[PDB]
Design a protein around this ligand. Sequence first.
Ligand code: SF4
Lengths: 135, 308, 192, 100, 175
Amino acid sequence: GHPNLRRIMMPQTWKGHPLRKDYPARATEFSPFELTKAKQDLEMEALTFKPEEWGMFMFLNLGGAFRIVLQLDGEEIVDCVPDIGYHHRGAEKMGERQSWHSYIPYTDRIEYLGGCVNEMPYVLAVEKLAGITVP
Amino acid sequence: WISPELIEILLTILKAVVILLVVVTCGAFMSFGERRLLGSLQLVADMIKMFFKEDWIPKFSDRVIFTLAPMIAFTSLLLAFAIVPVSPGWVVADLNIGILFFLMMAGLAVYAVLFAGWSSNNKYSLLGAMRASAQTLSYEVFLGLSLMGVVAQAGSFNMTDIVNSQAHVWNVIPQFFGFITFAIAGVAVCHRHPFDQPEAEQELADGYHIEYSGMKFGLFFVGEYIGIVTISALMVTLFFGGWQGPLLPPFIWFALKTAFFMMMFILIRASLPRPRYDQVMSFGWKICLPLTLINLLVTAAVILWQAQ
Amino acid sequence: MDYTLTRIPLQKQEIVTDPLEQNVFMGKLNDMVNWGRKNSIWPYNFGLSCCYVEMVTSFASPRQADLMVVAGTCFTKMAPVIQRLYDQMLEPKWVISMGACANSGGMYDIYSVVQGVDKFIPVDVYIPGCPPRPEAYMQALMLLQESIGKERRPLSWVVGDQGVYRANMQSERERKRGERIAVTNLRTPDEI
Amino acid sequence: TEVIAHHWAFAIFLIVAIGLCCLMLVGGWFLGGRLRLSAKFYLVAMFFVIFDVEALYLFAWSTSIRESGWVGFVEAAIFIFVLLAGLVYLVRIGALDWTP
Amino acid sequence: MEFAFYICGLIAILATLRVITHTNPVHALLYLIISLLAISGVFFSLGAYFAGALEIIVYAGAIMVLFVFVVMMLNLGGSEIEQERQWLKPQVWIGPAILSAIMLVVIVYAILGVNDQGIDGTPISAKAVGITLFGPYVLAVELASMLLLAGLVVAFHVGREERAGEVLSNRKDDS
Ligand code: SF4
């Protein structure tokens, strides 16, 4: 009973599920055929747009950096479902891959303005797991 | 076939070509001058790079007006400079309509923006071209009246009669309203910084300079600056003293005053922020046009009062 | 020095010698062309994740810039955008890869990260390390300026060889080897 | 024997300006290897056209300002009064403000 | 200034001939622009400097501006009319053309039979137009101002939007 249940972070042409334990957490062999295919999908996504997959008058894609699908009654915005997942670094899956000590730079690279603020919660939760009372 | 009339004619042709090259290199050099004020061989390097780059015709466009819009943007406000006299014996055009011709050129200046907006097969570029064209029409409507203040003071359209009527008093001080209206109209028509890039209020609008690469973009890049230098020349020859000075030679005085006015334009680049589009149109329709009409009526009453 | 050429990631490049070792008018004209391409370079700072503030604080319409700075991480959903923006540009074109994320996978060897920009488009100049300083970018501008200053590209598409020539430059690590090895002492990290 | 030289100078200036632009463009080329916009834009263009044609009467007035006496000043004054009445009508109705 | 007049007339006739039998309208408007420029050159060649300067100031600097503004505004390329190609069919092309050409030959027969004193010099500047514009012809420009005011009122009342929006997709009968 969930409306527009689709892939939000990964592209819609994805085979498996990333955070599942049997999914290999490595970059595969970069075949240029997939790149050309995805470029061709990006080519006709604006003219042959299908307003049924996104859960949606004129339809456009307005280009952190991300694109949002915009439906307009003239110039008035009627519906808007933003497209995210374009910066998916996979922090949690690598959190399953790195040790407790080696995840600290990955904790920095969540948001760039925060940094030390970003590594505070991971360090405090790891101290909670270990049972460390800092002075 | 050596005759002195042919020698004098060829000397006049030489005068025409040296004034063309000097205005072109003046615009090209103080492009870098403004970029430093915000290495003169850097423009030569840029010209070499632009010459050794392929012009892209878009496959959805046509090969005529896409290249003819930078043609208008360069040459229309280039031949606007043919009117300007720099000296009693160094003028290239002594025809009677010395103000109407600049009005022709400024009227044809909107063609470049409109044709570029259609030529870029892009709805946002078309909307941006509509905004810019509406602005430049809304200011070139009273550009003519700002010039007609000085025209009515000096009688005829000829710039020689203008600068000879500037003998006793320059036209800047009796007509300051005409001066500021002409400055505002020349800023807006040539797309100078405060009345520039009207895409700032809508993200469904884009510039007409987009999809122009290489030589077709360099034509705009040098055309706006040749336009601002010929607008400065128009300004000095109309409101200030054209070639008029006590001691230094007249062409030196003309160059000094032109340089002074585009350093004033650099000060304009530095000081004021960009107003909103509605404020720009409301200003140019409600304040400037009645003020210059009142200026024309006032200078008419003045020139008919002390007519003895 | 030796030269590589590309003529018409899967392309073929082999070692040749420059044609200027053999018309003295063409040698001066090609040098002037390389000089003009050197001192006038327009970058296209690509908007990506988090080397932006290093290109924001260092100091721009596309298709007029002959230089492209690929800065952030190259993802599977963003790589076609990179390829489309690269083919939007017109030759001659050069690429600077900022940060580790553009040189390589860059700390992300994971399923959703393309391992470097080299996988789909060639890169001319690399800058290593998580976020590089703008001075490193400006030194890379020097590096690509001198690399552009020594090339052999065709002047026109009517007469001449229809292949651009890249220079097999000496690497910066061997050139700086004496100055880097000959470092005796450093400041201790207990002070500022 | 001077205006012919001036016309010749005008001609070579125009011809060599278009020729310089043509050679510049072809030297750049040779080397290297259903919607609707609005109606207010049309309205402001029409304002420009009508006020430019009234400005034409002001253009022709400005050259003969002295040779026509005070009666010509009165006629141009009532012309400008009609022009400003139209402009203030346009101001007061609300068809001149943008409000994006 | 006679060969300039003849060549300007010839390219004006050619430009308006390409205007009449064109397909996409923006190129036809460009051809009309250069035709108006040529007629302005004709005006300059006959001593009417004010007339040619006016043609490029007003007729080519404002009126063709309105035409291209409308065309570039509502986005016609001649769609659904280029593919029909009615004007490049002959059974419609002979009739009006030979009728209006019969008009052409009869009106140029009416042209001849008038004495030829030639176009003289003495170019009439804007000063003469000014002194005869506010002398005998005062009510001409006063009621022409009234006429332009009426035209502005008519076209503003007819052609305003009545809807809010700087981007509008086309609805039938305006919603
Ligand atoms: S190199 Fe570092 S700072 Fe730059 S994009 Fe990658 S994670 Fe961000």
